[PDB]
């Protein structure tokens, strides 16, 4: 009768041990699952807000330079880029090439936060330009970061709504050009030649991507960006490969996958060709310069010896190589696994809802302009705010109904103000952070809970089989 | 002593087999769970972008027709729709009725992509009108689809940002009407009588729903639509009932649940009443015509015999029946299970973030207009771009500061351009696709992992019970 006993015991043992092997195999493939939960009690970290002027250059500083005699380089540069033929003519008829081939003048022409940010107010407390760290970005020359993680440790929202949040009255400084001057529309550029502010609401301590990640905002409108905070926490080894590292770039940035991809693209570009792209994050590696830098362009323009014929092609080898490598990188994602890099173990993103409204009312424009002057403008009678304030002040102090002229003055003041000024509120709609946490699909505690009951008896029965077998 | 043995063995067997029955029952109800994970390496399929002009008709072609003598039908149609009384007077005082009762003239009046799309640029490469497939939609007459899945197989984004994405400089062709003519505001229409472009960013190869799924975009603003790709993969039988089929409509569309619901609504409407709705997708079934077609409206207007009194009611039975069936379908979702149809096993959706900015700067308007002419307009001196370009060119070539007149010319050029022109960028913010995959809640491998350990021993003990019982 023991034959049936042995056969059924063997069959049961094989079944149980195959089941246990299947379980330990399921654990061996370290699967993960993303669990989303709304945490309404965890403190919300206010993001980092990078504001850029969509128009990089300022026509006011340009006009000032022509009225003086320090614009010669620019006057040379234009005279150079418009006399010789260049490949990618659209690139060096643009402003990025102007930045690359002469950087100091580009800085001297770019916008300043003083002139740009006219009023700032965070968490019901006044903030100044001292809360914004400046940085540079080609085609978005000057970009200023509030809550950049450098001046102060970090900023937190304990309150929702646009009242408890960043509020920026910004003048885009859209100034009328020189009397006989018009800019060149770079048609290979999908983001520039627009009036407004490019805002990047990104994770605190992470480098901004004004081109890729920014959203633009128009003048003459109060635009409110309500944010919902998403916290994506990942698993390190062995379940995943995220690390709590920090990107290098120019300055230590909190790690984000896209920013690291941009940095490794810049490094690959630096390796393949001996130049660097102003589209990608800066790296400041000696002696690497910008791609599309004609080193002797001043000498070429200065036709000291007549080997440079009119409308002659200029090589620009580095620019072509950069274009080739950028095309290969943009049309193929295989590089993403070479420079590797990893997702941040903890990442913070934001769902932004942008809603705009007509701002400011013609009723409050005079009271606005009064304070904007009283705080920021002691000079420059030839300014929009001043011409607008003259109209509004003669309306409010004539010394019934608005006359046609009175109406014309009010309308001209409103057009000036709303062509130049915009309010931008950035706030948390709710303090409930939506957390996507990566969890082990088959935890080790789960393995123990699913094997121990079998294993405790079946190791003993294996010992029984041993004793019955060879003794 | 064996009585206690038998009783405890029986109790344990009943418990174990009830547990196994509970598990196999849990498997019998083929539950599913949606698991969301962010895949940062899978290739992202660029969507299909359908641009429509919010104003279906073009006042320019209308004026041209009146200056010629081929507008008679229209001149008759108006003279007809405004002389006789009709139920739903708002419907046939609209443009959809004009399309339905005389289609060819509606096509001749509708917008052309040439005139509409002024500059296109996808993935840093120039694109023309040859990349857009035309299609028709009542109240959105001409709708042009980029990446429609017909001209080429499919399009992929390997790069983020507005630079590597679709960029469309579109002129809405908002032309001033005839000197003594005004349109009729159809107040039963919540979407028309607006200036802009209706954009549908929908799954590639899926029919566009400009009314239901489109979002509108204003002229004079560069609007950037950043897309985040969501891939929802479902389970076929036995867990679900999705299929990888294709809708028919006019042309083979990739299956989406809403589009199939619209098609089955159109089929139900074709069955219940012998007509068809221009609001719903077209089907082109002979000999079915549009609801709200008065077949002899030309004969009715031509008062050859005076049985048609002034302001007399006209029956329009088919229009009333279509209104009845549409009301019943819109106020009751029970039809959704009759025409059945299923969710696509694999569906692609997009979270779009639209941010607008003032475009173009007055600095770059002349350089823009120059190229728009040099590429697209050899004729029509009586055009906005031409009058605007005259102003800008006399500003830039007068042959200091802008004079009042100079300022007036600049302002009038800017108003014309920004009333007619708009830039639209559509791009992927990130290439990380958020994939919601439907997974078996209780997989068969899980059933085996949860039963085998018990089953291996307990079938053997059942054999023991057999042997002890009847032998």
């Amino acid at each position: 009768r023991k034959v049936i006993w042995a056969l059924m015991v063997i069959i049961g043992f094989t079944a149980a041990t195959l089941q246990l092997s299947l379980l330990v195999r399921k654990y061996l493939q370290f699967q993960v699952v993303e669990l989303s939960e709304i945490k309404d009690s965890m403190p919300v970290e206010y993001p980092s807000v990078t504001i850029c002027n969509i128009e990089p250059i300022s026509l006011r500083k340009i006009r000032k330079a022509y009225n003086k005699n320090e614009s010669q380089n620019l006057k040379d540069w234009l005279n150079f880029t418009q006399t010789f033929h260049f490949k990618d003519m659209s690139f060096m008829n643009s402003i990025r090439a102007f930045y690359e081939n002469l950087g100091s003048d580009a800085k001297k022409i770019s916008h300043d936060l003083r002139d740009l940010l006219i009023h700032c107010r965070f968490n019901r407390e006044e903030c100044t330009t001292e809360n914004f760290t400046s940085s540079f970005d080609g085609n978005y020359f000057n970009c200023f970061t509030f809550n950049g993680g450098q001046l102060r440790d970090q900023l937190q929202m304990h309150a929702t709504g646009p009242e408890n949040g960043l509020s920026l009255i910004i003048s885009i400084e859209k100034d009328e050009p020189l009397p006989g001057t018009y800019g060149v529309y770079n048609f290979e550029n999908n983001i520039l030649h627009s009036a407004g502010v490019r805002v990047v609401v990104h994770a605190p301590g992470s480098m901004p991507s004004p081109v890729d990640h920014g959203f633009d905002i128009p003048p003459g409108y109060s635009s409110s960006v309500g944010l919902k905070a998403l916290l994506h926490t990942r698993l390190s080894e062995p379940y995943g490969n995220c690390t709590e590292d920090s990107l290098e770039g120019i300055q230590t940035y909190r790690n984000t996958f896209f920013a690291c991809l941009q940095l490794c693209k810049q490094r690959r570009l630096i390796r393949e060709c001996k130049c660097k792209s102003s589209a990608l994050p800066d790296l400041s590696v000696e002696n690497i310069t910008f791609c599309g830098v004609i080193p002797d362009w001043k000498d070429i323009r200065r036709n000291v010896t007549g080997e440079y014929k009119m409308n002659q092609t200029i090589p620009t080898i580095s620019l072509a190589c950069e274009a080739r490598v950028q095309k290969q990188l943009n049309n193929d994602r295989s590089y993403e696994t070479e420079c590797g890099c990893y997702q941040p173990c903890s990442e913070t993103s934001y769902l932004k809802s942008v809603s705009l409204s007509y701002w400011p009312l013609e009723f409050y424009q005079l009271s606005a302009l009064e304070r904007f002057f009283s705080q920021k403008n002691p000079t420059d009678q030839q300014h929009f705010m001043k011409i607008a304030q003259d109209f509004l002040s003669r309306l409010a102090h004539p010394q019934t109904s608005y006359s046609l002229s009175e109406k014309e003055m009010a309308k001209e003041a409103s057009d000036l103000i709303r062509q130049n000024l915009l309010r931008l509120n950035i706030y948390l709609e709710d303090l409930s952070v939506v957390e996507y946490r990566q969890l082990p699909a088959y935890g080790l505690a789960d393995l123990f809970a699913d094997i121990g009951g079998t294993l405790g008896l079946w190791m003993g029965i294996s010992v029984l089989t041993i004793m019955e077998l060879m003794e | 002593r064996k009585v206690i043995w038998a009783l405890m063995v029986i109790i344990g067997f009943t418990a174990a087999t009830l547990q196994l029955s509970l598990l196999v029952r849990k498997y019998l109800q083929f539950q599913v769970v949606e698991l969301s994970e962010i895949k940062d390496s899978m290739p992202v399929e660029y969507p299909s972008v359908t641009i429509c002009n919010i104003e279906p008709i073009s006042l320019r072609k209308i004026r041209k027709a009146y200056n010629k003598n081929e507008s008679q039908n229209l001149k008759d149609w108006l003279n007809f729709t405004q002389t006789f009384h009709f139920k739903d007077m708002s419907f046939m005082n609209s443009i959809r009725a004009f399309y339905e009762n005389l289609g060819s003239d509606a096509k001749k009046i509708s917008h052309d992509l040439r005139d509409l799309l002024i500059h296109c640029r996808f993935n840093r490469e120039e694109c023309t009108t040859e990349n857009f497939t035309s299609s028709f939609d009542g109240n959105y007459f001409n709708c042009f689809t980029f990446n429609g899945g017909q001209l080429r197989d499919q399009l992929q984004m390997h790069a983020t940002g507005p630079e590597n994405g679709l960029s469309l400089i579109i002129s809405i062709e908002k032309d001033e009407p005839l000197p003594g003519t005004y349109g009729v505001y159809n107040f039963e229409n919540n979407i028309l009588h607006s200036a802009g472009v209706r954009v549908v960013v929908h799954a590639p190869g899926s029919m566009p729903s400009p009314v239901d799924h489109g979002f509108d975009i204003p002229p004079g603003y560069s609007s950037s639509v950043g897309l985040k790709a969501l891939l929802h993969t479902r389970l076929s039988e036995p867990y679900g009932n999705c299929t990888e089929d294709s809708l028919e409509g006019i042309q083979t569309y990739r299956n989406t649940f809403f589009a199939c619901l619209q098609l089955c609504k159109q089929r139900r409407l074709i069955r219940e009443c012998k007509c068809k709705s221009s609001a719903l997708p077209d089907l082109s079934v002979e000999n079915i015509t549009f609801c709200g077609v008065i077949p002899d409206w030309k004969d009715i207007r031509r008062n050859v015999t005076g049985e048609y009194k002034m302001n007399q009611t006209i029956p329009t039975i088919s229009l009333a029946c279509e209104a009845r069936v549409q009301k019943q379908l819109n106020n009751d979702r029970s039809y959704e299970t009759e025409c059945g149809c299923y969710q696509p096993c694999s569906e692609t959706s997009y979270l779009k973030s639209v941010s607008l900015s003032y475009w173009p700067l007055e600095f770059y308007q002349l350089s823009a207009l120059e190229r728009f002419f040099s590429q697209k307009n050899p004729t029509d001196q009586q055009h906005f771009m031409k009058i605007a370009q005259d102003f800008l060119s006399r500003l830039a070539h007068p042959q200091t500061s802008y004079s009042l007149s100079e300022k007036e010319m600049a302002k009038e050029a800017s108003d014309l351009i920004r009333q007619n022109l708009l830039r639209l960028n559509i791009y992927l913010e990130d290439l990380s696709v958020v994939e919601y995959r439907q997974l078996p809640a209780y997989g068969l491998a899980d059933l085996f992992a949860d039963i085998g350990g018990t089953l291996g021993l307990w079938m053997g003990i059942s054999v023991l019970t057999i042997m002890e019982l009847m032998e």
Binding site: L78, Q82, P177, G183, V184 | -
Partner: peptide
């Protein structure tokens, strides 16, 4: 980047 700007003509006259």
């Amino acid at each position: 980047f700007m003509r006259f």
